[PDB]
Design a protein around this ligand. Structure first.
Ligand code: CNC
Length: 241
């Protein structure tokens, strides 16, 4: 009846399940996501439907991936981190058994090769990380190249990843208050440098420092993500109990 207490209760339940393992949780309305998108990407839910954007902080690697590797057998052709994230998104269901919930991870792609969710658009409208796009630089320098956008977290910079959306059909919060993402890379020259670093130099990691981060990925975590996905899956499978 009154949704404000309901949103807080649901958020707290999801945070209790996910925050100990290195995730953060942000509510948004489905309408805010659909509003920005062409119909191919629309979530076919009523606009006031409550959703949650899930991202991983640097701590996810130690708090979730490492214990996961000790307890679960790795499947082929799926990155270990994606298997870990699928496991933890699955725990959200166990934590709300009396609700119909729908979960779409960042790694999910349609047979037509479109991603099932636009993770960066969800992160922006959930107020979690400003999504910096080519059109945020007027008269940008890149011409007729594809230039991908990039989200920057106000606490972690680019040292984070977007992991999924949790949708709660039937739970409608038309008055959920919009929380705008922090424009933490405001200047033109910094926006150009960020987009250049992400698009053409992302293997040197430096785009993630576009704001000073409270924490970075550990050198061990950086070793993992620096390793080609085929090799890291082969090596972790080799060493598993
Ligand atoms: C496919 C994909 C994806 N990738 Co890559 C990965 N892995 N990626 C790739 C590949 C191609 C990317 C591409 N084609 O653009 C490749 C090339 C495989 C790749 C590579 C990388 N990726 C990388 C990363 C980190 C990420 N990738 C994701 C973007 C990550 C995605 C995860 C996900 N599920 O979203 C991902 C699965 C889908 C991205 C996509 O297709 N978007 C392109 C297009 C469809 O979206 P768009 O450009 O934003 O356009 C929409 C918006 O503009 C929106 N819109 C319109 N008006 C507005 C107004 C506003 C205000 C807003 C907010 C939106 C809009 O509408 C448009 C659609 O019509 C990421 C969000 C995944 C994650 N966090 O788990 C993450 C970025 C995180 C961040 N800080 O933003 C890499 C560094 C490698 C890595 N470590 O994984 C590297 C970076 C180079 C690069 N060029 O991106």
């Amino acid at each position: 009846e009154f949704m404000e207490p309901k949103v807080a209760e649901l958020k707290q339940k999801i945070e209790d399940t996910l925050c100990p393992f290195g995730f953060e949780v942000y509510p948004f309305q489905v309408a805010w996501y659909n509003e920005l998108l062409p119909p191919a990407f629309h979530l076919p839910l009523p606009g006031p439907t409550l959703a949650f954007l899930v991202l991983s902080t640097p701590a996810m690697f130690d708090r979730a991936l490492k214990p996961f590797l000790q307890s679960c057998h790795l499947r082929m052709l799926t990155d270990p981190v994606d298997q870990c994230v699928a496991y933890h998104l699955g725990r959200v269901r166990e934590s709300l058994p009396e609700l119909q919930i729908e979960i779409i991870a960042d790694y999910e792609v349609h047979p037509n090769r479109r991603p099932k969710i636009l993770a960066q658009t969800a992160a922006h409208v959930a107020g979690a990380a400003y999504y910096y796009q080519r059109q945020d630089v007027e008269a940008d320098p890149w011409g007729n190249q594809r230039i991908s956008g990039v989200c920057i977290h106000p606490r972690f910079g680019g040292w984070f990843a977007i992991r999924g959306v949790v949708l709660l059909p039937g739970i409608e919060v038309p008055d959920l208050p919009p929380r705008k993402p922090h424009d933490c890379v405001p200047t033109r020259a910094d926006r150009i440098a960020l987009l250049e670093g992400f698009n053409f130099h992302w293997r040197d990691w430096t785009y993630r420092d576009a704001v000073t981060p409270q924490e970075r990925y550990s050198e061990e975590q950086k070793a993992y993500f620096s390793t080609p996905p085929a090799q890291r899956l082969a090596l972790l499978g080799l060493a598993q109990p």
